[PDB]
Each structure stands twice: as structure tokens, then as C-alpha cells.
Symmetry: C4
Subunit: 548 residues, 4 copies
């Protein structure tokens, strides 16, 4: 762009100069030597001289003619044998060499940059989040204060990289944080708090902070973070619900204090092997299966779908409906013993979850935790022989192998399954390239940090236009009033009246559900609506519909 314009601007200067010299030529040939030449001849002569061809078939004879001829001759050499290669090599090659042998850090962002997503702090989580939304061509800009990292990130793109201090208000100004679509804060908790307070001093751009410690979640929202995601707490929890011999209800949300969302692993449950409509969950519980999660895919629950030992049911309903489901499972086995290998922030949260039930566990680690003081840990290297044995791995019922190193996880899953083919093995994969090999080692289930983290962050980014909306709001369930038995969503006009929105429409005697129904959906009789709105519109709901 910038260089091309200067390139053909030079072509316009030459073409003008050509016509100039061609005209002066015809002029002088007439007024000095009494020769009349055509316009074409003038162009023909001028080109002949500049290109240094020099046929000599049209030449001057006077000194003044020699003078003009010499000038046109030098002009050609200067502007076709000197400037043209030099001008080329300086405007073209200087960028091409300097920028390719010598990393020039992107210190700023173009002023016209709008609707971009600022990523702070790169890791397998955000690394995956980028790659999964780069398939979507989202304008991603990751920032870092590490020189040796910026150029590394420049090689696999992907994305754009800005090198500067994430907390610096001036660096943020050059990042155009005001025009930003969203901001992912994945630095340490003290750094994130610094980032949020600084961003808030410039704009109100929505920030998603990935809090390094569940306690610091409150402090980050105070800093200005519109959303807070405790990964390890969630990741550890996901390691835990899978670790038990028989699956149990896992409470997710208790909004509105009457409607709850809860997930349930199907492994070890009576629902394992049967289909959804066969087990009759909604039938005996009154719940709403709002999705079946299996192998990284949230699918619409159908009666044909066969629940496997690796499934996960997303459920919604009242408080007495969840307790009705826990009754059907219904009891947990006795004398469970869960070995948790690795005592980091994830391994800790894994035990923390298993303690909220509670279930007797054992922690094994190489060193003393610098953060936790509430858990008892058996100190020892899980690789060195007899270390697991002496800890009493024999009477264990399940093992959570959660180490910061994947090859070690794979090696422990490999060894444990080799010694105890019976016990349940849950493995943790830091990188998603190691997930398959963990299953191949003998693990019954694998929790991938990167993928799980990317899904959460991603969904919070896609549903962003309704994220801070749905935040501070309460989801609710209303049985379709017999008045609208046969009316269309667009015809009913629910939103302009009440203010809420239809997120789900399920049939009377069916586990089948219609997630996010289009306005042209024709409602039926006995259907059960699941809506989302403010804790003010939920009360002005039954008010508005009955009073029109």
C-alpha cells in the first residue's frame, strides 16, 4: 500500500517526464534545425535515449541540440539506472531483510482497529482458545512483556503479537482497549487485578479474568472484571466427579433459589447402557435434560441416544426434583478410597471437591504446597518404586493422576492399570495432544485442561452480547399456559410484553428438547418453557401474560 503508491507515483513522474522531453524535442528540432517531427517520433526518440538504446538515426547537429540530448541522456541514467534500482532496494528490500532477520516488535495497534479481543498471558488454555477461534477468523491480539516470547509467538500465526507491559495505561491506549470487543485476563491474580483497574480507567470493555485462586474471585470483580473463571477449581471438580465408583449429582447453579442446573456422570449409574427415554429420567424426576455431553460434544438429548460409561447429563429443575434423582441412583458404594497423585492447585481442588461430599482420599506429592495448609499430603515421588505401595494404593478404589507433566501422567496411568485392572483411573492432560495416549494407557476418563478451559472462555466470548446480560439474571421455568396452545413465538409476542426470552421448548411426554427455538416455532399443548430474564421480569412475567 504505502510502498506501492510511491512506486507508481514514480511511474507517473517518468511518464510526465517522457512527454515533457518528447515535447521539448519536437520544439527544439523545429526552432533550432528546421526539422519537423511527429508526436510519435518524439516519444520514439526520447525512449531511445533514456533506455540508452541510441539508434543515432535521429540526432541533433547544433550545440544546443547536443546540450538537450546530453541532459535527456543523463536523466535516463539517473532515473532508470540509479534511482529505479536504489529506490526499489530501499523501499522494498529494507523491510524485507530487516523485518525478517531482526524481529521488530509490534509496540502499538492501528487507530482504526475495532472489535478485537485482547489476550493477556499465553498458555495451553489461551493457546487453544486462539486456535479454536482462529478457525473462526476472530481478530486476536495477544500481549506479552517477554521479548523472547513475542518473536516466538510471531512464528506460529494464527494471531498478532503486541510487545509491551500489559498493566501500563499507555500501552493499553495503543492497544485501543476502548474499541475492544473483549479482554481475556490470564495473568497471575496480582497482575490481573492491576490489569482490570487500569483498563477500567480507560474504558468499560468487558473483561474475563481467569482467577488463579478461588478466594481471589471477589477481589477481581472489584477490580472491574465482568466475569471470573476459576479453572483449576472447575478442572479439579471435573477430575472428582469422574473419580468416584458410582456417579453422583453435581450442583452447578442455584439461581432464583428455586431453579437449579446440575450435571451428572453416567458411569456406575443405572442409566449406564440404556437410552434416555428408556431410563425415564424426566419421568421420575420432573427434571429437564438440557443436554448430553460426551466426547467433547454437547448434543441435544434424544430418546434414541444411548448413554455410555463416559457420558455426562446436564440437568435443570427445582430443588426437590434433583433430590428425587439422587434417590434413583441412588446410594453410593461403601469404603471408597481415592488416590490423588499430584498436589498442585488442580490436585488440591480435586481433593477439595471430594471433601465436600465427603469421600476419603489420599494426597501424594514431591514437595510441600506453598499455597495450601488445609490438606494432609504424603510426601514422596510417585515415580520411585514402592512409593505408591507404601501409601496403600492397594485398597484404593480410584486414582486421580494429576501431574503438571503429561508423560508422567501417561506413565502412571500405564503403571497403575497394569497393577490394578479393576480400579477407576481419571487422568489429567495439560496438553490435548496427550489426551488420546492417556486413554490408550488405561484411563477410564481424561480431563483436558486446554480444551475444557477453551470451551468455557469461548462460550463466554460468543455469548458475550448476552453474557453480562445473563449475568446477574435468573433462569426460570414456566409451564406453557393453555391459552397459547397453537400460537407461534413471534405471534405470542412474549419478549415485547414481559421482557424475557425463550431458550428451550420441550414436549409433554418427551425427553426431547428444542434449544433456542426460532420465532416461527409453533407452540403446542402441555409444553414446558425454559426462559431467561432479570429477577424483575420473572415476576412481571406471570403478571404481563395474564393481564396482557
Amino acid at each position: 500500500r504505502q510502498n506501492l503508491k510511491v512506486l507508481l507515483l514514480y511511474c507517473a513522474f517518468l511518464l510526465v517526464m517522457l512527454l515533457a522531453y518528447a515535447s521539448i524535442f519536437r520544439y527544439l528540432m523545429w526552432h533550432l534545425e528546421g526539422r519537423a517531427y511527429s508526436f510519435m517520433a518524439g516519444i520514439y526518440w526520447t525512449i531511445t535515449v533514456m533506455t540508452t538504446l541510441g539508434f543515432g538515426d535521429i540526432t541533433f547537429e547544433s550545440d544546443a541540440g547536443y546540450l538537450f540530448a546530453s541532459i535527456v541522456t543523463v536523466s535516463g541514467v539517473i532515473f532508470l539506472d540509479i534511482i529505479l534500482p536504489f529506490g526499489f532496494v530501499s523501499m522494498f528490500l529494507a523491510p524485507w531483510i530487516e523485518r525478517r532477520l531482526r524481529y521488530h516488535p509490534t509496540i502499538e495497534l492501528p487507530d482504526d482497529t475495532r472489535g478485537h479481543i485482547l489476550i493477556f498471558g499465553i498458555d495451553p488454555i489461551t493457546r487453544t482458545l486462539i486456535r479454536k477461534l482462529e478457525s473462526r477468523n476472530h481478530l486476536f491480539v495477544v500481549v506479552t512483556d517477554n521479548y523472547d516470547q513475542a518473536l516466538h509467538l510471531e512464528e506460529q500465526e494464527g494471531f498478532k503479537v503486541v510487545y509491551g507491559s500489559p498493566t501500563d495505561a499507555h500501552v493499553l491506549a495503543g492497544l485501543r482497549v476502548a474499541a475492544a470487543r473483549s479482554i481475556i485476563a490470564n495473568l497471575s491474580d496480582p497482575d490481573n487485578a492491576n490489569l482490570c483497574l487500569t483498563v477500567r480507567s480507560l474504558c468499560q470493555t468487558p473483561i474475563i479474568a481467569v482467577v488463579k485462586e478461588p478466594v481471589h474471585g471477589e477481589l477481581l470483580r472489584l477490580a472491574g472484571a465482568n466475569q471470573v473463571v476459576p479453572l483449576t477449581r472447575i478442572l479439579g471438580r471435573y477430575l472428582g466427579i469422574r473419580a468416584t465408583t458410582c456417579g453422583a449429582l453435581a450442583h452447578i447453579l442455584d439461581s432464583f433459589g428455586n431453579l437449579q442446573i446440575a450435571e451428572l456422570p453416567v458411569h456406575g449409574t443405572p442409566f449406564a447402557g440404556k437410552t434416555i427415554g428408556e431410563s425415564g429420567i424426566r419421568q421420575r424426576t420432573g427434571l429437564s435434560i438440557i443436554g448430553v455431553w460426551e466426547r467433547g460434544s454437547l448434543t441435544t438429548p434424544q430418546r434414541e441416544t444411548v448413554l455410555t460409561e463416559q457420558s455426562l447429563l446436564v440437568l435443570a429443575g427445582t430443588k426437590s426434583q434433583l433430590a428425587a434423582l439422587e434417590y434413583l441412583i441412588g446410594e453410593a458404594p461403601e469404603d471408597e478410597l481415592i488416590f490423588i497423585i499430584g498436589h498442585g492447585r488442580i490436585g488440591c481442588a480435586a481433593a477439595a471437591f471430594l471433601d465436600r461430599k465427603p469421600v476419603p482420599f489420599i494426597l501424594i506429592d514431591r514437595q510441600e504446597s506453598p499455597v495450601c495448609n488445609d490438606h494432609v499430603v504424603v510426601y514422596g515421588d510417585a515415580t520411585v518404586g514402592q512409593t505408591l505401595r507404601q501409601a496403600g494404593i492397594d485398597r484404593a478404589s480410584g486414582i486421580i493422576v494429576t501431574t503438571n507433566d503429561d508423560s508422567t501422567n501417561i506413565f502412571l496411568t500405564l503403571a497403575c492399570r497394569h497393577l490394578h485392572s479393576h480400579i477407576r483411573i481419571v487422568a489429567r492432560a495439560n496438553g490435548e495432544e496427550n489426551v488420546d495416549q492417556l486413554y490408550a494407557a488405561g484411563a477410564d476418563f481424561v480431563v483436558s485442561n486446554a480444551s475444557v478451559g477453551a470451551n468455557i472462555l469461548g462460550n463466554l466470548l460468543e455469548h458475550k452480547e448476552s453474557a453480562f446480560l445473563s449475568e446477574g439474571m435468573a433462569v426460570f421455568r414456566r409451564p406453557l399456559p393453555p391459552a397459547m396452545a397453537g400460537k407461534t413465538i413471534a405471534e405470542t409476542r412474549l419478549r415485547p410484553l414481559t421482557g424475557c426470552s425463550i431458550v428451550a421448548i420441550e414436549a409433554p411426554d418427551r425427553a426431547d428438547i428444542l434449544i433456542s427455538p426460532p420465532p416461527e416455532t409453533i407452540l403446542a399443548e402441555g409444553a414446558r418453557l425454559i426462559l431467561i430474564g432479570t429477577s424483575e421480569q420473572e415476576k412481571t412475567f406471570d403478571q404481563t401474560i395474564a393481564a396482557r
Copy 2:
């Protein structure tokens, strides 16, 4: 600079032109009995060297052929070989040694005068530079570290010299004798070495920033004209702000500043508590409650509740900001005095809920500022 070699070549070319134009007329006359003008000789010579070659004026003798061949070869060598060979080996060569492979400045120009030498760059001296740009001094920072020299070279408001600060030959190339003033911001043993070395050459005014107030006397002995104990000053500020019976002040951070704060609150005297994750390697006169403050219980354990004031003094601004948030979140009214290492974090410490913020960069640069003006 490269101009002088280039237009000298143009001078030689111009001479070679007139020389060839002259011989042309002389030869044309004596060789073949032809009388050509001066412009004809210029026009002919140009036509030959530029290799245009109109052929309208050509010799017919062997002596004329030889000459023509000589002028032709000259046009090739001195326009199609040397002229481009010059180009690349005159200012495309310094282009690689200064833009493709970082070339550190190891010495200043001989005539350099009225410049300010900065030894040991930090947020304080970095701010001292951008605070005196309106006076338009020439700030030169000197570092014995290669990597630091490179980072300080891409961003600029000052000059960057790479070499041993404590070397006499390096100080000589820095033209210290012609310097306006020198700022010593290295460690105490280094500054002592820096002064004694400078004093062997010149008597340039030295403003040394001392690490321990006790060492201040020694730095004067070395040769410093002024000594600035900032952490005593910065520590004194934090202590003054924390106060202006049951009055308990928490000092979170037991470094040289935090220590100076505690040392100040002994003169009042006001009871205090020092919390740190590590035992001070320089101090053994204060009592420190050990344990990391970010973890959690330590603030509640030591009793942040019955405290009247809090002083957050960590070398990490992000940590400070985080602690200021936590304290303000726990006790919504307690006096919180925070420390700012960089001036970029001052606004966020107040946003976090601090009642007063002391900036090391601001206070530091202001003192060093008012010492370079009232020299």
C-alpha cells in the same frame, strides 16, 4: 558523512569528463583533420560512457579507435562497476552492521560536552530522564549488560553506552571530564568503585544514590559531591503518612524501604508489625512475622483487624495493588499507605483504595532533578 566520498567521486567524474572531452577535440583535429566544438566533446563523451552510442560522431583511424575503446571501458568501470560497488560498500554495508546485527555504542564522540552520565538505570532514573527533556540535556545511560543495552536502544529518549562502568578506559571514552554531572545509581560497593575511578580522571560532580545511610559517609570519602538516601526518605514518607494509645500499624514488606519505615516508627514511637516472606539479608534489628502475605491467613492471623494503619511496601506494584484491594475489602476504612515502584501504577493504588500513595520514581526523580538544576 558518506556524502564526502560520493561527491569527490562526482568531482573525479566531472574532471574525467572534461579531460576526455578535451582529448577528443585534440585527437579529432590532429588525427583526422576535424574541428569539433566544446559541447560536441561533452556530448560525445557522455554518449560513450553512458553507453548510449549514437554513432553520429565516430573516429575512422586506429588511434581514434583505441581512444574510443578507452573511453568506453572507462564508462563501464567508473559507472557500471565502481558506482554500484561504491553504493553497496559505502552505505548498504553500514546498514547491516547497525540494523541487522545490534552494534552497541562503546564510546562517545571526542567533542561531546555538557552530557549527563547515568550509571544504573531504573524506574527512578528512567523517570529522571523523561522529566528533564524540556531542558534538552543529553542523557547517556551506561550498562555492562548486553541484553539491557539492546532493550534500551530500541526505545529512546537518551543515549545508550555498553561497557564496564568501573573501567578507567571506558570512562575516558565517555568523556567524563567534559560531563555536566554523573549519577551513581549502582550498588554501594560499585558506586565507591565508580567514584574513585572518576576522581582519578576528573572532578565531575557526582550525585551518588547510596543503598545504606551508613555508607553515605564512605561515598563522600570516595569522591561524591552529593549523597541521596532515598529508601530512608521513602521509608520516612510512608511512616509520616501512616500516622499523620491503641494504634497498630502493619508494614507489609521488610526490604530496605519497609525497614526504614519501621525504623522511623520507633522514633515516634508507634507499635508496628513487619510481615515478610523472607528474613532480611541486611537487617537483624527488627522483628519480622514470617510468611507470605498473598496466601491468605497471614493477614488474619497476625491481626489485621485491630490495626489502625497499613503500609504496603513490596518491590512489586502488582502485589501492592492486590494487597491494597484485599485490605480495603476487609476493612473499609483503615488507613492504607501504598508504595509505587513505577509511576504508571500510582493511579491504580488509589483506585484500589489507598488513602495516600508514595511514588519511588516521582520522589526519586524530583530530588535528583532538583540536584542537577541547583548544581
Copy 3:
């Protein structure tokens, strides 16, 4: 490779030549009633584009002038612009991306077959390469470390690929399915990961060098076709040489080899003493006399006098050589069995006074050698 783009251009140029030579004759005829030969058209066209410009054959019409101008401009663009622009941006450009800034090979050519993948380069596998060069295999070493890739690139007898050994997409680009054999010389957890990943793609024979004999069974489970416990073997060798009552053997070095030596001398059984500067991070079944052996008294303290044999087993050949000298200098006849990490130090261990020398590189490469031949 760049040839094909270059001579295609020569083909285009040749076509453009004949095209211009043809139009020339056609125009000369129809425009000005002149009949020129084919060679005249070639000769004229060349003369114009090369900008020689004899002017002996020139048009006199405007249509002829236009054409001449077009052929002239073409000679400039397609010989003085594109021809050099091609040059620089065709094989002077790969010259910078491969000789001025190290470009690591991240993938092998699609057709690559019969190659041997080496995972984890060391004096053993480095010797395995230079020991099978007469068979002319294609050895490719793979390292996830940038710096190591660069050092292994300047010196060569093998191919160097940079990337994560435990990545499926990286193994796919290494064409493991077409590989002759794979050598796993990484840590035990890594090899387990390496095998399980390879087995998901292909069933290429894997020769895994296991770190702990107990883990050998696990590596077979992972997918290895052969497992080689060298330190057990190397330790066994040292023990066999140390012997073939009051017989005391000193083992200087308590690593996995030294441990294996001690583990072997328990089966005999022959009393021994293990001397090391550090407690073994993997072993807790042997008794080690702690203290550095180079310092001095430790050899005299433990009683190197009443010993019958000495086994020097340190991961440092220079240390070994030095200890072998010291022992031979103290006791001029005592049995000294030394360990050689590299094969370059074997001769100096004997020169130092060793009675027999076991070379890790030699023994290692020979086993791995006879496993790739009798596949």
C-alpha cells in the same frame, strides 16, 4: 529446483524473441515495403532488447516507431528489471532464510522412506550414527530444544528435525509409518508417551532404551519391540571386570550405573563401598559414604588402602581420568576399572592407569547396532 522457474522464463523469452522477430518482418514489409530475412529479424530484435542499438536497421514510419518503442521497453522490463528481480527474489531470498537466520526442519519430505528416527541424542546414539554410516542409512535425530537443533545442524552425519517428539502431528510429518526403525532414548515417562503415540499411527519397530529395568515391562506394554537396559548392562560389566576372603571394592559414583554395579556385587557376594557427593534420588537400598571424592581425604578416610579393586563411575570422563590417576598414584597395583562416557576418553583412562575400561558409547552403540541389523 529454482531452475524450472528460470528456464520457463527463458522459454517465454525465446518465444517473445521469435514473436518480435516475426512481427518485425511483417511490419517492415507492410509498413515500409522492405523485405528482411528471418536472421535479420532475430538480429534486429536482439539488438533492440539488449539495448545495443546499431541503428543500421530502423523504421521511418510512426507505426514502426511505436513498435520499436514497444520492443525497447520490453527489453528493459524483461531483462533489466524482471531478470534481476527474479534473481534476488528466487535464490538470494532462500539464501537469507537458510544461512543468516537458522531455519529448523519441522517436517520430512512426503516420499521419505527407510529412515531411522532417533529420539534423544547422546554420546551413545551419536556413536550409533557414525558406526552405521557404511550401511548408508538416513539417520534423523529429533529434539524439542531449539539450541540443540542448531548445534546438531552445523556438524552433520545425520538429519535434524525440531519439534515435540510426543506429538502425533509431528510424528506424522516425520513419516514414522515409512520408517525403518525408531530408537527411543528419552526418559522412561517420555518413551512411554513416545511409544503410545507411535502405536496410534503405525507399527514401526521401536527399540526403547529404558532408564530403570523395572520399567522395561511397562515399555513393552506401551508398544516397544525391544527394550535395552544399558546401565544394568554397563553396571554388570564394571562389576564383572572388578573381580574376574578379604576383598574390598570401591565404587566411586552412585548413579544408575554405579548402583547397578553395586547391585551386581551383591549376587556374588563381594563387599563394597559406595562413595558419592549426593544422595541418590532414585535409590534407597544401598549404603553410601557421602562426600566429594575429588577434595582429598575421602579416599584416604574410607580406606582406599585395604581395598582390592576400584570402580570409577562418574558421569564426567575428566573426573574419571583424574581419579584414575590419583588411585594409580597412591596404590600402584590395585585393580582399577574405569567408565568412559565418550569413546574419545577411552585411551586416556588407560593412559591414566586403568586395568580395564568400559565405554558406554561403544557398548551402547554395539547393542543398538546389532538390533537394527538383526531387526
Copy 4:
């Protein structure tokens, strides 16, 4: 060289091609068009075509003539517009860019390399040794196995740098160690032993090893080292002789078991302030002052020379003559107390020397020595306040400030002199750039590691042709027999008869001495000769002279 030859070989190809085309031109012009042109015309035409000038005044008219003309035209462009710039840029610029932006390690040395000095292991010692003999233009080649060090050393030269494993026999082969003049082994003791044993497997080139531990001196000579230099032991010793309040005799050599060399510091001695001939040392001792060392200069002792508080007398004589001198000093002060700051290998040797007298000392250090177990050390940081005070620095009589850090040394010398203007301060300078500032701090004497080490190594390199000669030999002293009273050294023929050599000739009643007298020196009556020879020629000395 290599590139220049290819350059003007191309000029010879062109000149031949010019003459070729010029000849074929005249040939064709005759046989094809009946035109006769001169030799000059042919050159004139051919040049005109190749250079693309193209006057057109001499042109062909036939097709065959057009064919030849076109060939010469293309030939010119290929060989003056294509090959000439390309050939240039590939033979010239490729070395100039690649070798200047990308370090190409010198892996080998040219076969014809003879009489070079191989330096192994670079440090302030060898760094100085190089710079001091690079003023002498000695062919120095330093070797290293550190990639990030080889290119650093390439920037300040000085010297040439070979990058390879010093112990590798193949790397040594490429270094041409056989043709080497000498080898300086300055690696660790285990590495040096490896180096020597390897070099000895190839050649018998003299090796000077710098042993890191005085005990390992025996083991290195066994490895093949022709010479062994314990620097710290020597450096520590030099710190010690200067530390005492009053100087004392320091025994250097006891060769032949009757002649000894010994040095003596003049500080605190009665000789301080007076001249050599005034104190009358040779007079009252019978010794031979073979040199006066002051301020880095070994000068010939003259009666005019004034001994200062910083002088050092190099002496030679029998065993009873040295004891006669210690009598003249003659006694040491009482209750001396020497504080030695820093307990490394040098600080250790300093105490080791002070214990061989003995003199009560105190050691202070930050940490426990990993090598020594014989000395008691007061653990503490000498920078932190009251640390020296509590150790009892008050009743000390002298301080040896010997730290690995010069700025610290300077800062301690500065502080100690400020608190105790009376006590003697000996300081250690790792780098010679810090020597002057140590004196400026208040030190009474400074021992520079680099300079002292360079002098020893240097003298062992210059006197190399007589180093291994004088090694294993015994220096002796013989009173000039009255028979040669008036005869010249060359006339006497001492060497061809006995086998020894005259190294010194001193006068009867004079402290003046003639070091290394020229053969034309006319001997006198009563002169005292100091010779050097084998322990076999010293006995065949008095035998040969008396029996002719």
C-alpha cells in the same frame, strides 16, 4: 587470495574472448563481405558490442554476419551484465554477509601453522597474558567448548578463536598440537589432566598447567605437564608476606641443597628509606641481590636505588647467609593479628602461608568452604554492619581483604582505612583495572591476580627454550678463580668445557650486578659468578676448569 584468483582468472577469460571475437570478426568481414579491417578496428568493434555501446558505424550486411554479431552481443550481456555482477555477489558478498551476521566457528587450523601457543580456558589471567604478548605479536590461539564465548572472544582481537572440545584428540589434531610452540592448560584440574594425557598421545609439545589445587600438582606432571603453576598458592603467599607489620624472608627455592633464592619485602624493615649500598646487605650477609622488584618492574639493583615501603628484594645465597639476614631485620613484633576477609582458594592460601611462620589470623566468609576443612572460619557477611567489629577487627594489626569481587574489596579497603588509619591493609585485585582505586582507597599494597599470573606464565613462555632445560637443573655460585683475572667470557670458553652458563657477574665490593652478561664481558678480579647447569655439570665444573 582464493577469491582474487578466480576474479582475475575471469579477466583472463574475457581478454582471451575479446581477442577471439576480434579475430573472428576480421575473418568474417573478409571472407563474407570482402571488407578488410585492422586489428585495432576488431578490438574497437568487439568492445563496442559487448559493452552494448553499438555505434553501428561498422556493421554486417549478411545473415551469417548478423548471426555472429548477435552471438557477440549475447556473450557480452551474459559475461558483463549477468555473470560479472552475479559472480561478484556470490564470491564476495556471501562471505561478507554470512560471516558478519552469522558467526562461523573456526573448527580447525590451517595445516601450515607452526610455532603457535595454544591457550585453554580463558580468564583475567590468560586474558592479560594474551594482551601482553599480543603487543609482541605472538601467534595466540585460544580454544573453548563454549559457543556463546567463542563469538564473544571473536569481537576483541587480539587473538584467534577455535571452537571445539579441548580434550578431544581429533580437535587437538586439527589444532596442530605437534607443531605447537607451547600449551597453556588453564582448565580445572580434572580437565587439565585430561588435556595433558591427550596431548601426550599425539606429541611432546611442552605444556604449562595452571593447577587449581597445590596437592594436584604431582598428578598433573604425571599427566604430562612439563610445568606446573599454583597461582592461588603463590597469590595468597604474596598477600601474606605483605600483610605482616614487619617484612620477613620468604624462601623461594632450595635447589642443590646449598644455594637458595628468597624474596623479602622492605616494609617495616630497617632497610626502608635507605639505599642498597647504604644498608649494606651483601656486606653483612654475603648474599646476592639478584633484583629489586617495585611497582611491577624487576630492576637491576644499584647503590643509588632507594628502597621504599613497597619494595621487594630478590636474594640468592647459601643457607647460613639467609639466616644472617633474618638476624639483621631482625625480630618480628609481638601480638600480631591478621584479619583475612574472604575464604576462597586464595584467601585460604593466604592463611596457609601465615600459618607456616606462624602468625595468628582470623578468617571471615559468607559461606562454608567446599574444599577446605583445616581452617576455622567466622561465618558472616563482611558488608553487613558490625560483622567485622564482632569478630574483633579492633585489636587486629593487619587486614587482608581478598574477595572475588573488586568493588567489594575497594569498598572494604575504603571502610577499614576509614576506621583504622594505623593498621596495614593488603588488597586483592581480580582485574588490573581496579588496582589503582584500591590504592586510592587506602591499601598499603595491592596484589593483582592477572598481572602476577601473566608475569609468571609469560616468563615461562619466553624462557621456554631454557625452561625445561633449567627445569631439573640446579643454579650455583662460584667465586671467579684468579686465573681468569682479565679474561673475556668468550675467551675463557666456559660453556664448551664445563657445560654451564654465566647468568650473573657481580663486582667484589659492590651490590651492583650484571644480569646475563654478553660474551664480550671482560672479567675482573674478585668477581662472583652465578651460573646455572645440570646437577652433573656443577660437579664437572671445578673439575673441568682446574684440569682444562
